[PDB]
Every structure is written in C-alpha cells, then in structure tokens.
Amino acid sequence: VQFEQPRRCPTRPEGQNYTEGIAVVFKENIAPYKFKATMYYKDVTVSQV
Amino acid sequence: WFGHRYSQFMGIFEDRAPVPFEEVIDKINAKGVCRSTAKYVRNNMETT
C-alpha cells in the first residue's frame, strides 16, 4: 500500500461584483387625483301648508 | 303653478313602480313593449 497524495483543494469563489448606485423605487399609484372645486347652486324649497 | 310670466314647480312626486309579472311575460318578453300606465300598490292603496 501507499499513502494518498495531497488533493487539489477548493478555492474561495470569486465573489459577487456590486455596482454602487442610487435608486428611486416607484409603485403603482392608487391615490386619486385631487383638486379644488367650487359649487354654485340654490336650495329651492316650496312648502305647501 | 302658472304665473303671469313664469312657470314654477310646486312639487315633483317621483316614484318607482314594479312592472307586474303579467306585463313582463305578455308585453316585455313577448313583444318588447310596455304599458303606458302604471297600476301598483303603494302605501296600502292601488294607484294608477
């Protein structure tokens, strides 16, 4: 018999490359459009007494 | 009410009357027509 000679060891994987950056994350708008209005009307009441 | 130079609504009575079964069967589904009259029970009274 003979001794097994050294095995080829694993390596540390290269790792992940990251791009630095600035982000703005947008979502679907569920908010209704809002604005100002003015109503002009007249309450007309006729009473039969 | 009809004034001298104007007309005014004194009141507008609005009501929803059901279409009777016989009119649905015999007029609407049979011919696509409705009766021009509404005969129905409102406030414990038969009104036409």
B9 neighbourhood in chain A, CB within 8 Å: 46
B3 neighbourhood in chain A, CB within 8 Å: none
Who's near B48: CB < 8 A, 6+ residues apart? Answer: B37, B38, B39
Provide the shortest C-alpha distance from residue B10 to chain A (in Å).
Answer: 6
Nominal resolution (angstroms): 2.2
Helix (H, G, I), strand (E, B) or coil at B19: coil
Nearest to B17 by CA among B43, B44, B42, B45: B42
Nearest to B20 by CA among B5, B37, B44: B37
Nearest to A48 by CA among B15, B9, B27: B9
CB atoms within 10 A of CB A32: 6
